[PDB]
Amino acid sequence: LSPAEFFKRNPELAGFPNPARALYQTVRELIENSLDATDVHGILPNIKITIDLIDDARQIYKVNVVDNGIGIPPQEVPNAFGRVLYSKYVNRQTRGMYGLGVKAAVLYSQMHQDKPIEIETSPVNSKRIYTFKLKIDINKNEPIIVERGSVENTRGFHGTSVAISIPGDWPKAKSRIYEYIKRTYIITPYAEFIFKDPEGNVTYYPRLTNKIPKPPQEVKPHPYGVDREEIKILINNLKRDYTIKEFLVNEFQSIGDTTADKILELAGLKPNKKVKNLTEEEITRLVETFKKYEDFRSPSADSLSVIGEDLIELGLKKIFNPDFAASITRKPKAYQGHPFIVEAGVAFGGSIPVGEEPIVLRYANKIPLIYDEKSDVIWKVVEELDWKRYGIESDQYQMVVMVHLCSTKIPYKSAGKESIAEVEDIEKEIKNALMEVARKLKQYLSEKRKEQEAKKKLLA
Ligand SMILES: [Ca+2]
Ligand SMILES: [Ca+2]
């Protein structure tokens, strides 16, 4: 089965089990693309989100997201929204759990209602705004251009507007849609959002800074990460006729002149042989060799993008108005051929609510994880930590804890659930990060208690 057909038969595994989740997911897919279209390219995101009830009785909602991003070349629009791929190795951090991305919303839209999706886009420095009304052919997995136009652009405008009409359920999805937006804002203080909901409520999320974290850079795949099927994709993807040596050193990370030489012998392949002429045994051998070689450099972290200690603290402070906040961005680690970094943050006191458990905010590649929190490896680590060792004395406290995992391979427990898996190496690092911030909080609490006792005992 193709991704598209599998989606249609198993929507509940792709984030679309019912209209409420469909509505929530469509909103996230659009906001996520708009962020990746802006901040990754050095643009402060100005994002507008509107949801309108367009058919009361059948509960169809129109979701519109507008950004000031880099836009999309006109010739790329149809496929970007209306052609699902038959299978991409990730070499750059991107926002989103689901492989189909916005295409899942498009499919769902075309499967349950009749309006086309509406797109208006203008690439940087384009003299035109290009308009489209499109559908995806639900049987052929191909774009249908219903309408294609263009209008004159204005000075310095660039960006994209996307409108998709879908079955939805606002009352059910409402709280989690707001929470999604709120949590996105917390770690994206350099973005400005406007949200108008179907009831006509408007919420404004002002830009708090103009500092944008460093962008992800595409990297070549690291050998520990590739499967045969992946190799014979980089192979049939070459424009030149490389030699096997020519190919290990130019299409992979951490393979230099000398390392390739070794790999070649280990795998019993000849440098001079041309890669296109490999065999299902020469390959098997390469992969097994890859999996068994112990002298590779760790997967480069250039492909990752952190929120940053400053931005995490800025967001926690501005949104929660705590007495104290702290954060840590850990040094990169790696697992199964992919780099990963954990960042963590804590906010304590102030206007934050009293309760018997901390508020736990989970992020993966800069995206909120909203559902399935109790099965997530982050919840597990937070619950297992004994906060009394860190200065928390009462069984009721006011604390927010945040954890961000970024990687080119986030391990999820199950398709259609937003919970990160308990991979040992990742769990270990999440615990190390939380402890680092928990110790900053312990120091805060100990200094505060000392100041209080001093005033009580020494001041009149
Ligand atoms: Ca995405
Ligand atoms: Ca505990």
Quick synopsis:
With 460 residues, this protein is an alpha+beta fold.
Which compounds are bound in this model?
A: calcium ion
What strand order characterises the main sheet?
5-4-3-6-2-1-7-8
Q: What is the CATH superfamily label of the largest domain?
A: Histidine kinase-like ATPase, C-terminal domain
Give the amount of beta strand, in percent.
15-25%
Number of helices: 12
Rg over alpha carbons: 25 Å
> By helix and strand content, what is the structural category?
alpha+beta
Outline type: globular
Number of strands: 14
- Please give the share of residues in helix: 25-40%
Largest sheet, in brief, is: 8 strands, mixed
How far do the termini sit from each other?
Answer: 78 Å
How are helices and strands ordered from N to C?
A: HHEEHHEEEEHEEHHHHHEEEEEHEH
Count of discrete domains: 3
- What is the third-level CATH name, the topology of the largest domain? Heat Shock Protein 90
Verbal overview:
The protein is of the alpha+beta class and 460 residues long. The chain has three domains: 1-210, 2-Layer Sandwich (Heat Shock Protein 90); 220-297, Orthogonal Bundle (Helicase, Ruva Protein, domain 3); 305-460, Ribosomal Protein S5, domain 2 (2-Layer Sandwich). 32% of the residues lie in helices and 21% in strands. The chain is built from twelve helices and 14 strands. The chain has helices at 3-9, 19-36, 77-82, 102-112, 170-187, 228-234, 244-248, 257-267, 282-292, 309-320, 377-384, 424-458, and strands at 46-55, 60-66, 117-122, 128-136, 143-152, 159-167, 192-196, 202-205, 324-329, 333-335, 338-348, 359-364, 367-369, 399-407. Strands 5-4-3-6-2-1-7-8 form an eight-stranded mixed sheet. β1 and β2 form a beta hairpin. α2 (19-36) packs antiparallel against α4 (102-112) and α2 runs parallel beside α5 (170-187). It is globular, with a radius of gyration of 25 Å. Bound molecules: calcium ion (CA) (2 copies). One calcium ion binds next to α11. Its EC number is 5.6.2.2. Keywords: ATP-binding, DNA-binding, Isomerase, Nucleotide-binding, Topoisomerase. GO terms for molecular function: ATP binding; DNA binding; DNA topoisomerase type II (double strand cut, ATP-hydrolyzing) activity; identical protein binding.
